[PDB]
C-alpha cells in the first residue's frame, strides 16, 4: 500500500518512502468569518465571528 | 356526564395505551421513515458534491 483514502475519495493517510512509518493528512483549519455589529447609526464597534 | 362515572376505566385506558405507545416506538425499526430519509438525502447531496 501507497496511500490511503476515505469515503469522500480524498487523500488521508499518506506513506512516506524513506521511513515505513505512515503519516495522516488533515487539511489546514478553513472556516468561515462572520461580522456581529449594531446599527451604525447607534455604534462603531464590531464583533468578529469565526 | 359520562366521563366522571368511568374515570378509573378512562385512566388505565390511558395508561394502557401510553404504555402500548411506548413499546410500539421501539419495537417497530420503520416507524421513523421521514427524518431518517430526509437526513440521508442531506448526506447524499452533501457526499455526491465532494
Ligand atoms: C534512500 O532512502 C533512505 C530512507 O531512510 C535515506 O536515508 C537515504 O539517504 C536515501 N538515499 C538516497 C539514494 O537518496
Given at each position: ?28 483549519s478553513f472556516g468561515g468569518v462572520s ?14 465571528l469565526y | ?50
Open positions: 500500500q501507497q496511500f490511503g483514502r476515505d469515503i469522500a475519495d480524498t487523500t488521508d493517510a499518506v506513506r512516506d518512502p524513506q521511513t515505513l512509518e505512515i503519516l495522516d493528512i488533515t487539511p489546514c461580522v456581529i455589529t449594531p446599527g451604525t447609526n447607534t455604534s462603531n464597534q464590531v464583533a468578529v | 356526564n359520562v366521563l366522571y362515572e368511568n374515570q378509573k376505566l378512562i385512566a388505565n385506558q390511558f395508561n394502557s395505551a401510553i404504555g402500548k405507545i411506548q413499546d410500539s416506538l421501539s419495537s417497530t425499526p420503520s416507524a421513523l421513515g421521514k427524518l431518517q430519509d430526509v437526513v440521508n438525502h442531506n448526506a447524499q447531496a452533501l457526499n455526491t458534491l465532494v
